[PDB]
Amino acid sequence: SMEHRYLGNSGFKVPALGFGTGFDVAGARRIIDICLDAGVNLFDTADVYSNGASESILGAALKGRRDKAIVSTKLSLRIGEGPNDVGSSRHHLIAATNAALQRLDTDYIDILQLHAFDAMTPVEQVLGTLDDLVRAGKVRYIGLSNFSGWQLMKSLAAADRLGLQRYVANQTYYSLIGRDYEWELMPLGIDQGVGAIVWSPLGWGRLTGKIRRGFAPPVDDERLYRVVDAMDEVALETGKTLPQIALNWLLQRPTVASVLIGARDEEQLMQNLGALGWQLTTEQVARLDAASAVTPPYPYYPYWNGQFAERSPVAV
């Protein structure tokens, strides 16, 4: 049975596992149906995924069942050659939102996320445009991806001050080999009620077990192998697969509302659902955390090493 979680402080619930189209019409309908049957009813896409084709294919697959789905999409990355075919200025946000609705073949999007930070458009303007889309019924909830801590906080404070809609979802990279989310974005999310929707949870296929002795730093072989060693040890104790361990570990982390998985078929979906219904023990998590730990940058370092932890403890 699918577990459901609150998306930040929004009061809206998402399934703990979602389907990341980061996409044969019959095949797409089948994937949607096996997902829906399993309770995986969050579907995530973006305008840039295959130049709009991912949204169109999703829309076509959901047609007839869209009311059973939570549709998450992203915009603001460059999607054309024109000088205004990019960013978060009012012109592009309006045009891109309408274009996504057309491709998805629906009258509303459940979660609309800005795909990157546009420093060239004032956050007050962006939030006004998003608020208007929400009030018009085109969007229910809003979120973001790839913002700095300060940029997200700036936006949340502006929304509150202006009485506009606030971000409730952060589409973030987070995995055992990519724990950077923990430094700024996680404690911000805790403080401000922003829930994480996690992508590349296997660190771009690196935590599958296949490997053994654009958005993320390449990972050093030695560190990867140390993490895989620890996962192997846990796999022996638990009988679970490396992907199931990676996912189970994420689901225990603060703020995590949903983790986006891939599923080409029933068998793959079932493997991923094997992340649910059990829990890594405290000791197992501690072992995985020790193996995956990296030196925190300044200014997090003296909090993480205990010096300033008294008055500002770390969440993990």
Catalytic residues: 49
- The Cβ of residue 109 has, within 10 Å, a number of other Cβ atoms equal to 23
Strand partners, 4: 15
User: Shortest distance, CB of residue 93 to Cl ion, whole angstroms?
Assistant: 12
Q: Is 6 in the site for its own copies (CB under 8 A)?
A: yes
Answer for which of 17, 61, 188, 246 binds its own copies (CB under 8 A) is 188
Of 6, 36, 89, 125, the one binding Cl ion (CB under 5 A) is 125
Nearer to Cl ion, 72 or 200 (CB): 200
> With CB cut-offs between 5 and 8 Å by kind, which of Cl ion, Na ion, its own copies, none does residue 157 bind?
its own copies
Query: In the complex, what is the shortest distance from the CB of residue 315 to Cl ion, in angstroms, rounded to a whole number?
Result: 21
Which sign does the torsion angle of CA 258, 212, 179, 205 carry?
Answer: negative
By the rule CB under 5 A, 311 interacts with Na ion: no
List the beta strands (DSSP E) in 70-115.
70-75, 109-114
Question: Which residues in the 6-35 window bind Na ion by CB under 5 A?
Answer: 9, 11
Could you give phi then psi for residue 107, rounded to 5 degrees? -95, -5
Residue 1 interacting entry, from Na ion, its own copies, Cl ion, none, C-beta within 5 to 8 Å by type = none
As measured in angstroms, the least distance from the Cβ of 280 to its own copies is 23
One of 27, 122, 205, 254 touching its own copies (CB under 8 A): 122
Do residues 41 and 69 touch, judged by C-beta distance below 8 A?
yes
CA distance 116 to 86: 10
Stretch that binds its own copies, among 46-54, 155-163, 225-233, 274-282 (CB under 8 A): 155-163
Q: Residue 271 interacts with Cl ion (CB under 5 A)?
A: no
Asked if 316 touches its own copies (CB under 8 A), the answer is no
**Binding to Cl ion (CB under 5 A): which residues in 229-258?**
none
Q: How many residues bind Cl ion (CB under 5 A)?
A: 5
Query: Taking a C-beta distance cutoff of 8 angstroms, is the pair 191, 149 a contact?
Result: no
- Burial profile 24-51: b = 16 or more Cβ within 10 angstroms, e = fewer: eeeebbebbebbbebbbbbbbbbbbbee
**How many C-beta atoms lie closer than 10 Å to residue 220's C-beta?**
11
> Which residue among 200, 258, 272, 284 contacts Cl ion (CB under 5 A)?
200
Q: What is the dihedral sign for C-alpha 125, 128, 134, 138?
A: negative
10 lies in the site for Cl ion, by CB under 5 A: yes
51 binds Na ion (CB under 5 A): no
**Is 310 a binder of Na ion (CB under 5 A)?**
no
Query: Which residue from 49, 173, 199, 249 is in contact with its own copies, where contact means CB under 8 A?
Result: 173
Q: Which residues pair with 191 in a beta bridge?
A: none
Please name the residues in contact with 131: beta carbons below 8 A apart, sequence gap of 6 or more. Answer: 164, 165
Binds its own copies by CB under 8 A, chosen from 148, 252, 279, 281: 148
